[PDB]
Amino acid sequence: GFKQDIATLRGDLRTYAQDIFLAFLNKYPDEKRNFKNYVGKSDQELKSMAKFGDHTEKVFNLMMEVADRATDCVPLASDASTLVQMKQHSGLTTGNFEKLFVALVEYMRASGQSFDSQSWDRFGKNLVSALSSAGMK
Amino acid sequence: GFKQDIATLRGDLRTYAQDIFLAFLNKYPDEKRNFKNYVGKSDQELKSMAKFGDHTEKVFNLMMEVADRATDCVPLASDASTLVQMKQHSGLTTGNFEKLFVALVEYMRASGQSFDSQSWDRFGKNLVSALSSAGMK
Ligand code: HEM
Ligand code: HEM
Ligand SMILES: c1ccc2[nH]ncc2c1
Ligand SMILES: c1ccc2[nH]ncc2c1
């Protein structure tokens, strides 16, 4: 279930974070404008940049903290507020996050492993609604 | 305290994992008997070896999960048994683990941060006790 999936992801966090983020960027090419240092580069070129692996892992580490503090796949309002108020998120709307979670669930369903894809779909939808309640447009 | 320290380490885990493992290898040079590929290499050279970085991060990913599952710095018996039974740990003894935790605690005390170094000292001692209970020599 959802708690075991957090343990599966954390055990190899660097690899899962890179592969899910690449799946997102390739599914939604217009989303790459939030990341100007990544434009015009193949997947393997991206993986050779120190900050691509480091920052992508740090994003997924915070995602796993929020997931583990959730109740029945509903995140804490305080965690949603942190994501709204981060200076690095100043340009964003809930649609950016909606798309990330569509790509994450698609990756889990295609992987050939027993992820609880339905719980991750709920988590993404409940995170989007919490972001709106915490003040994201 | 201990729970916040797990969050701090997870926020920059590859960097902390490599720096603590180097501290261990440099404090106890005879411990390289179990790491023959790491002989004859300076710290900067080890940090550009793919397996050194990838394996060290995976070790610390699992260490943080064992710490997070503990109660009052006492690990689960199921986590201790996993660590005894892993094929990659055949022929380790509890002294290998004792020395890794001495180095980890020394690193925290020298860091200039606010780590709860006494809780990590207790965790290392309690993990050693649990590994003995689960059958490590
Ligand atoms: C639950 C989902 C998300 C979490 C937990 C999260 C978390 C983070 C964290 C921890 C950082 C700092 C990384 C660092 O400096 O090392 C970061 C930076 C950033 N985030 Fe997010 N974020 C999420 C979703 C998104 C989405 C959907 C976008 C845009 C599509 C986005 C855009 C950015 C940008 C532009 C930065 C700064 C640039 C960079 O680090 O390279 N975030 N985020
Ligand atoms: C709580 C402490 C520890 C945890 C959580 C842990 C976990 C792990 C994990 C997850 C791996 C697999 C790495 C991979 O294949 O990518 C591994 C391999 C290994 N472990 Fe540990 N371990 C710990 C302590 C130690 C200690 C103290 C030693 C020896 C001083 C050690 C020696 C090894 C060896 C020799 C391998 C295989 C060779 C290699 O990966 O280069 N372990 N361990
Ligand atoms: C969201 C997901 C993965 C990432 N890597 N770098 C910035 C970033 C934002
Ligand atoms: C213990 C700590 C760090 C490590 N890196 N690779 C194997 C290993 C064992």
Short mmCIF file of C-alpha atoms and ligand atoms in Angstrom, two decimals:
data_model
loop_
_atom_site.label_atom_id
_atom_site.label_comp_id
_atom_site.label_asym_id
_atom_site.label_seq_id
_atom_site.Cartn_x
_atom_site.Cartn_y
_atom_site.Cartn_z
CA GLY A 1 0.00 0.00 0.00
CA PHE A 2 0.89 3.72 0.30
CA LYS A 3 3.22 3.28 3.33
CA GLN A 4 5.22 0.51 1.65
CA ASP A 5 5.45 2.60 -1.54
CA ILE A 6 7.12 5.44 0.49
CA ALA A 7 9.72 2.79 1.68
CA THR A 8 10.25 1.47 -1.89
CA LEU A 9 10.81 5.00 -3.24
CA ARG A 10 13.07 6.06 -0.33
CA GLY A 11 15.29 2.95 -0.62
CA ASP A 12 16.47 4.18 -4.08
CA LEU A 13 15.33 7.80 -3.98
CA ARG A 14 17.91 9.25 -6.41
CA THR A 15 16.95 6.83 -9.20
CA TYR A 16 13.16 7.06 -8.79
CA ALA A 17 13.23 10.88 -8.46
CA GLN A 18 15.21 11.28 -11.73
CA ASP A 19 13.10 8.81 -13.70
CA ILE A 20 9.72 10.30 -12.56
CA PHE A 21 10.87 13.93 -13.14
CA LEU A 22 12.12 13.02 -16.67
CA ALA A 23 8.75 11.33 -17.39
CA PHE A 24 7.01 14.61 -16.35
CA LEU A 25 9.28 16.84 -18.46
CA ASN A 26 8.89 14.62 -21.54
CA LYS A 27 5.04 14.38 -21.17
CA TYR A 28 4.61 18.15 -20.76
CA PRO A 29 7.30 19.95 -22.77
CA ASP A 30 5.87 23.47 -22.02
CA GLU A 31 6.66 22.78 -18.31
CA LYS A 32 10.48 22.92 -19.03
CA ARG A 33 10.36 26.80 -19.05
CA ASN A 34 10.29 26.66 -15.27
CA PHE A 35 13.80 25.08 -15.66
CA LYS A 36 15.93 27.10 -18.13
CA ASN A 37 19.17 25.23 -17.28
CA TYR A 38 17.52 21.97 -18.54
CA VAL A 39 16.34 23.21 -21.97
CA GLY A 40 17.95 21.66 -25.17
CA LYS A 41 19.33 18.57 -23.38
CA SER A 42 18.64 14.85 -23.66
CA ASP A 43 17.78 12.72 -20.64
CA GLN A 44 21.40 11.42 -20.39
CA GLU A 45 22.85 14.95 -20.66
CA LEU A 46 20.55 16.04 -17.78
CA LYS A 47 21.70 13.15 -15.58
CA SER A 48 25.35 14.33 -16.06
CA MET A 49 24.64 17.76 -14.41
CA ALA A 50 25.40 17.82 -10.62
CA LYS A 51 22.43 20.03 -9.72
CA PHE A 52 19.90 17.94 -11.80
CA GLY A 53 20.35 14.86 -9.55
CA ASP A 54 20.82 16.86 -6.33
CA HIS A 55 17.82 19.18 -6.72
CA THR A 56 15.53 16.43 -8.12
CA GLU A 57 16.28 14.18 -5.14
CA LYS A 58 15.63 17.09 -2.73
CA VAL A 59 12.20 17.71 -4.34
CA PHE A 60 11.23 14.02 -3.90
CA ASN A 61 12.60 13.91 -0.33
CA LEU A 62 10.16 16.71 0.63
CA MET A 63 7.35 14.92 -1.32
CA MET A 64 7.98 11.76 0.75
CA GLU A 65 7.92 13.77 4.05
CA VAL A 66 4.54 15.27 3.08
CA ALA A 67 3.25 11.80 2.00
CA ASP A 68 4.33 10.16 5.27
CA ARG A 69 2.67 12.92 7.39
CA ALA A 70 -0.65 12.59 5.45
CA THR A 71 -3.76 10.88 6.92
CA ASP A 72 -5.65 8.62 4.43
CA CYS A 73 -3.71 10.32 1.54
CA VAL A 74 -4.84 13.84 2.72
CA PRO A 75 -1.79 16.13 3.33
CA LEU A 76 -1.48 18.46 6.29
CA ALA A 77 -2.61 22.06 5.66
CA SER A 78 0.73 23.23 7.17
CA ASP A 79 2.68 21.20 4.56
CA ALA A 80 0.58 22.68 1.71
CA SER A 81 1.31 26.16 3.12
CA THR A 82 5.08 25.49 3.08
CA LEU A 83 4.88 24.58 -0.63
CA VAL A 84 2.83 27.77 -1.43
CA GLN A 85 5.20 30.10 0.44
CA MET A 86 8.54 28.77 -0.87
CA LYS A 87 10.33 31.55 -2.84
CA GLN A 88 11.21 28.96 -5.55
CA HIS A 89 7.46 28.40 -6.15
CA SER A 90 6.51 32.08 -6.61
CA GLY A 91 5.51 31.68 -10.27
CA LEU A 92 3.39 28.55 -9.95
CA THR A 93 -0.26 27.51 -10.07
CA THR A 94 -1.96 24.30 -8.95
CA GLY A 95 -1.94 23.05 -12.59
CA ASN A 96 1.84 22.57 -12.42
CA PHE A 97 1.37 20.15 -9.52
CA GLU A 98 -1.65 18.42 -11.12
CA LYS A 99 0.52 17.55 -14.17
CA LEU A 100 3.41 16.28 -12.05
CA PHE A 101 1.06 13.79 -10.31
CA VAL A 102 -0.57 12.66 -13.59
CA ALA A 103 2.96 11.78 -14.81
CA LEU A 104 3.90 10.06 -11.49
CA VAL A 105 0.77 7.80 -11.52
CA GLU A 106 1.35 6.93 -15.23
CA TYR A 107 4.97 5.96 -14.38
CA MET A 108 3.79 3.71 -11.49
CA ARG A 109 1.18 1.93 -13.67
CA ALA A 110 3.75 1.27 -16.48
CA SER A 111 6.57 0.10 -14.06
CA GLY A 112 5.67 -3.63 -13.59
CA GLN A 113 5.84 -3.31 -9.82
CA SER A 114 3.11 -3.41 -7.21
CA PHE A 115 2.72 0.31 -6.44
CA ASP A 116 -0.69 1.36 -5.00
CA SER A 117 -1.36 3.68 -7.96
CA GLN A 118 -4.91 4.56 -6.83
CA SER A 119 -3.61 5.94 -3.49
CA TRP A 120 -0.99 8.14 -5.29
CA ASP A 121 -3.80 9.45 -7.61
CA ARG A 122 -5.86 10.42 -4.50
CA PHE A 123 -2.81 11.99 -2.84
CA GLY A 124 -2.13 14.17 -5.90
CA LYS A 125 -5.76 15.34 -6.10
CA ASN A 126 -5.87 16.09 -2.34
CA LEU A 127 -2.53 17.96 -2.53
CA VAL A 128 -3.92 20.17 -5.37
CA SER A 129 -7.03 21.00 -3.28
CA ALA A 130 -4.84 21.71 -0.17
CA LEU A 131 -2.57 24.04 -2.22
CA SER A 132 -5.67 26.02 -3.31
CA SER A 133 -6.90 26.23 0.33
CA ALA A 134 -3.42 27.48 1.41
CA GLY A 135 -3.51 30.28 -1.19
CA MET A 136 -2.07 29.06 -4.53
CA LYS A 137 -3.88 30.27 -7.67
CA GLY B 1 16.21 15.86 18.66
CA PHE B 2 16.58 12.46 16.94
CA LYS B 3 13.47 12.83 14.70
CA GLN B 4 14.52 16.30 13.45
CA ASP B 5 18.09 15.00 12.83
CA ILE B 6 16.65 12.29 10.49
CA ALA B 7 14.92 15.10 8.55
CA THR B 8 18.14 17.19 8.43
CA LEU B 9 20.24 14.26 7.13
CA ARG B 10 17.57 13.30 4.54
CA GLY B 11 17.57 16.93 3.21
CA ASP B 12 21.18 16.53 1.90
CA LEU B 13 21.64 12.77 2.17
CA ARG B 14 24.26 11.94 -0.49
CA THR B 15 26.61 14.65 0.85
CA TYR B 16 26.19 13.64 4.56
CA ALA B 17 26.41 9.91 3.68
CA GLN B 18 29.71 10.32 1.79
CA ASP B 19 31.25 12.64 4.39
CA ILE B 20 30.36 10.28 7.32
CA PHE B 21 31.57 7.17 5.44
CA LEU B 22 34.89 8.94 4.60
CA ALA B 23 35.25 9.90 8.27
CA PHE B 24 34.85 6.18 9.18
CA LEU B 25 37.33 4.94 6.54
CA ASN B 26 39.91 7.59 7.57
CA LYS B 27 39.51 6.95 11.34
CA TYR B 28 39.74 3.13 10.89
CA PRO B 29 41.94 2.42 7.88
CA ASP B 30 41.95 -1.41 8.55
CA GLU B 31 38.17 -1.37 7.79
CA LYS B 32 39.03 -1.20 4.04
CA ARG B 33 39.49 -5.02 4.16
CA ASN B 34 35.74 -5.05 3.37
CA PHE B 35 36.02 -2.37 0.64
CA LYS B 36 38.91 -3.43 -1.65
CA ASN B 37 37.90 -1.10 -4.52
CA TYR B 38 38.40 1.97 -2.24
CA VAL B 39 42.12 1.36 -1.47
CA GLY B 40 44.73 3.82 -2.84
CA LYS B 41 42.26 6.71 -3.46
CA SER B 42 41.98 10.21 -1.95
CA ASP B 43 38.55 11.50 -0.79
CA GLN B 44 38.02 13.51 -4.02
CA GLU B 45 38.87 10.46 -6.13
CA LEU B 46 36.32 8.28 -4.17
CA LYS B 47 33.63 10.96 -4.73
CA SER B 48 34.07 10.52 -8.53
CA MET B 49 33.71 6.67 -8.39
CA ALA B 50 30.11 5.78 -9.42
CA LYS B 51 29.63 2.83 -7.00
CA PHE B 52 31.09 4.76 -4.04
CA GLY B 53 28.40 7.45 -4.38
CA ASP B 54 25.52 5.16 -5.37
CA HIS B 55 26.13 2.42 -2.76
CA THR B 56 26.89 4.93 0.06
CA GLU B 57 23.59 6.75 -0.60
CA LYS B 58 21.64 3.43 -0.63
CA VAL B 59 23.22 2.42 2.70
CA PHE B 60 22.19 5.71 4.34
CA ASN B 61 18.67 5.67 2.68
CA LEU B 62 18.03 2.38 4.57
CA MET B 63 19.80 3.60 7.76
CA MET B 64 17.41 6.57 7.95
CA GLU B 65 14.38 4.24 7.54
CA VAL B 66 15.66 2.01 10.42
CA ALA B 67 16.17 5.13 12.59
CA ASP B 68 12.66 6.44 11.67
CA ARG B 69 11.01 3.07 12.55
CA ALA B 70 12.73 2.95 15.98
CA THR B 71 11.09 3.73 19.38
CA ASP B 72 13.30 5.74 21.81
CA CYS B 73 16.30 4.96 19.59
CA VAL B 74 15.66 1.13 19.75
CA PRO B 75 15.30 -0.43 16.27
CA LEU B 76 12.68 -3.01 15.20
CA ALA B 77 13.75 -6.65 15.48
CA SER B 78 12.65 -7.14 11.82
CA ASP B 79 15.14 -4.41 10.71
CA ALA B 80 17.96 -5.99 12.76
CA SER B 81 17.25 -9.43 11.22
CA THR B 82 17.31 -7.96 7.67
CA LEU B 83 20.72 -6.47 8.35
CA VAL B 84 22.14 -9.80 9.74
CA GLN B 85 20.70 -11.90 6.86
CA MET B 86 21.66 -9.70 3.83
CA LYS B 87 24.11 -11.59 1.58
CA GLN B 88 26.28 -8.44 1.34
CA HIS B 89 26.79 -8.61 5.14
CA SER B 90 28.04 -12.23 5.31
CA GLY B 91 31.14 -12.33 7.50
CA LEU B 92 30.61 -8.84 9.14
CA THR B 93 30.65 -8.72 12.98
CA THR B 94 29.10 -6.26 15.40
CA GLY B 95 32.44 -4.45 15.77
CA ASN B 96 32.16 -3.16 12.17
CA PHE B 97 28.85 -1.45 13.12
CA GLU B 98 30.18 -0.18 16.50
CA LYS B 99 33.03 1.65 14.68
CA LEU B 100 30.76 3.16 11.99
CA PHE B 101 28.57 4.72 14.75
CA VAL B 102 31.59 6.02 16.74
CA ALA B 103 32.67 7.89 13.57
CA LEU B 104 29.12 9.14 12.89
CA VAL B 105 28.78 10.57 16.43
CA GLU B 106 32.26 12.19 16.25
CA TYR B 107 31.30 13.81 12.88
CA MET B 108 28.09 15.25 14.42
CA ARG B 109 29.92 16.69 17.47
CA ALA B 110 32.54 18.40 15.18
CA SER B 111 29.92 19.77 12.68
CA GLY B 112 28.96 23.03 14.46
CA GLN B 113 25.27 22.23 13.96
CA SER B 114 22.59 21.26 16.56
CA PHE B 115 22.55 17.44 16.12
CA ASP B 116 21.38 15.38 19.16
CA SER B 117 24.65 13.44 19.22
CA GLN B 118 23.77 11.54 22.42
CA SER B 119 20.63 10.02 20.80
CA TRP B 120 22.78 8.79 17.82
CA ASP B 121 25.26 7.24 20.30
CA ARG B 122 22.35 5.35 21.97
CA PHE B 123 20.96 4.30 18.53
CA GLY B 124 24.34 2.81 17.55
CA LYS B 125 24.62 0.89 20.86
CA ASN B 126 21.00 -0.36 20.62
CA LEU B 127 21.47 -1.43 16.97
CA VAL B 128 24.59 -3.43 17.97
CA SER B 129 22.58 -5.12 20.79
CA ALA B 130 19.77 -5.97 18.34
CA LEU B 131 22.21 -7.36 15.71
CA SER B 132 23.71 -9.68 18.41
CA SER B 133 20.16 -10.82 19.45
CA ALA B 134 19.41 -11.58 15.76
CA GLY B 135 22.56 -13.73 15.42
CA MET B 136 25.52 -11.60 14.24
CA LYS B 137 28.85 -12.62 15.77
C1 HEM C 1 4.90 17.97 -4.17
C2 HEM C 1 5.64 18.51 -5.14
C3 HEM C 1 6.86 19.35 -4.98
C4 HEM C 1 7.76 19.42 -3.95
C5 HEM C 1 7.75 18.56 -2.67
C6 HEM C 1 8.73 20.44 -4.30
C7 HEM C 1 9.85 20.76 -3.51
C8 HEM C 1 10.95 21.59 -3.89
C9 HEM C 1 12.21 21.70 -3.18
C10 HEM C 1 12.58 21.01 -1.87
C11 HEM C 1 12.98 22.57 -3.91
C12 HEM C 1 14.41 23.00 -3.58
C13 HEM C 1 15.45 22.16 -4.34
C14 HEM C 1 16.86 22.68 -4.12
O1 HEM C 1 17.19 23.87 -4.21
O2 HEM C 1 17.76 21.89 -3.88
C15 HEM C 1 12.21 23.00 -5.07
C16 HEM C 1 12.76 23.93 -6.03
C17 HEM C 1 11.97 24.26 -7.17
N1 HEM C 1 10.64 23.84 -7.46
FE1 HEM C 1 9.50 22.52 -6.45
N2 HEM C 1 8.38 21.07 -5.46
C18 HEM C 1 7.31 20.37 -5.95
C19 HEM C 1 6.69 20.62 -7.17
C20 HEM C 1 7.10 21.55 -8.17
C21 HEM C 1 6.47 21.72 -9.43
C22 HEM C 1 5.25 20.95 -9.94
C23 HEM C 1 7.21 22.71 -10.10
C24 HEM C 1 7.02 23.23 -11.49
C25 HEM C 1 6.47 22.54 -12.48
C26 HEM C 1 8.25 23.16 -9.21
C27 HEM C 1 9.23 24.13 -9.51
C28 HEM C 1 10.38 24.35 -8.73
C29 HEM C 1 11.44 25.26 -9.18
C30 HEM C 1 11.42 26.09 -10.46
C31 HEM C 1 12.42 25.18 -8.22
C32 HEM C 1 13.73 25.98 -8.24
C33 HEM C 1 14.69 25.62 -9.35
C34 HEM C 1 15.53 24.44 -9.06
O3 HEM C 1 15.56 23.93 -7.92
O4 HEM C 1 16.25 23.97 -10.00
N3 HEM C 1 8.12 22.49 -8.02
N4 HEM C 1 10.92 22.43 -4.98
C1 HEM C 2 22.91 0.61 9.81
C2 HEM C 2 23.96 0.38 9.03
C3 HEM C 2 23.96 -0.22 7.66
C4 HEM C 2 22.94 -0.26 6.72
C5 HEM C 2 21.56 0.37 6.79
C6 HEM C 2 23.52 -0.98 5.58
C7 HEM C 2 22.85 -1.19 4.36
C8 HEM C 2 23.42 -1.72 3.17
C9 HEM C 2 22.75 -1.64 1.87
C10 HEM C 2 21.34 -1.08 1.56
C11 HEM C 2 23.66 -2.19 0.99
C12 HEM C 2 23.48 -2.38 -0.52
C13 HEM C 2 24.28 -1.30 -1.34
C14 HEM C 2 24.11 -1.46 -2.84
O1 HEM C 2 24.21 -2.61 -3.37
O2 HEM C 2 23.94 -0.45 -3.54
C15 HEM C 2 24.83 -2.60 1.74
C16 HEM C 2 26.00 -3.22 1.18
C17 HEM C 2 27.18 -3.49 1.90
N1 HEM C 2 27.33 -3.32 3.25
FE1 HEM C 2 26.04 -2.49 4.57
N2 HEM C 2 24.76 -1.47 5.90
C18 HEM C 2 25.13 -0.92 7.07
C19 HEM C 2 26.35 -1.09 7.73
C20 HEM C 2 27.52 -1.70 7.19
C21 HEM C 2 28.79 -1.74 7.86
C22 HEM C 2 29.06 -1.22 9.24
C23 HEM C 2 29.66 -2.38 6.98
C24 HEM C 2 31.12 -2.66 7.15
C25 HEM C 2 31.96 -1.97 7.93
C26 HEM C 2 28.88 -2.75 5.80
C27 HEM C 2 29.36 -3.44 4.67
C28 HEM C 2 28.65 -3.60 3.46
C29 HEM C 2 29.27 -4.22 2.26
C30 HEM C 2 30.69 -4.77 2.20
C31 HEM C 2 28.36 -4.13 1.27
C32 HEM C 2 28.54 -4.67 -0.10
C33 HEM C 2 29.67 -4.11 -0.92
C34 HEM C 2 29.34 -2.76 -1.48
O3 HEM C 2 28.15 -2.31 -1.49
O4 HEM C 2 30.30 -2.05 -1.95
N3 HEM C 2 27.54 -2.44 6.01
N4 HEM C 2 24.63 -2.37 3.09
C1 LIG C 3 10.36 19.74 -9.43
C2 LIG C 3 10.69 18.38 -9.66
C3 LIG C 3 12.03 18.00 -9.89
C4 LIG C 3 13.04 18.98 -9.94
N1 LIG C 3 14.38 19.05 -10.16
N2 LIG C 3 14.90 20.37 -10.07
C5 LIG C 3 13.84 21.20 -9.79
C6 LIG C 3 12.67 20.38 -9.72
C7 LIG C 3 11.33 20.73 -9.44
C1 LIG C 4 28.62 1.05 4.87
C2 LIG C 4 28.64 2.45 4.74
C3 LIG C 4 28.86 3.08 3.50
C4 LIG C 4 29.07 2.29 2.38
N1 LIG C 4 29.25 2.51 1.07
N2 LIG C 4 29.37 1.34 0.31
C5 LIG C 4 29.19 0.30 1.16
C6 LIG C 4 28.99 0.80 2.48
C7 LIG C 4 28.80 0.21 3.75
#
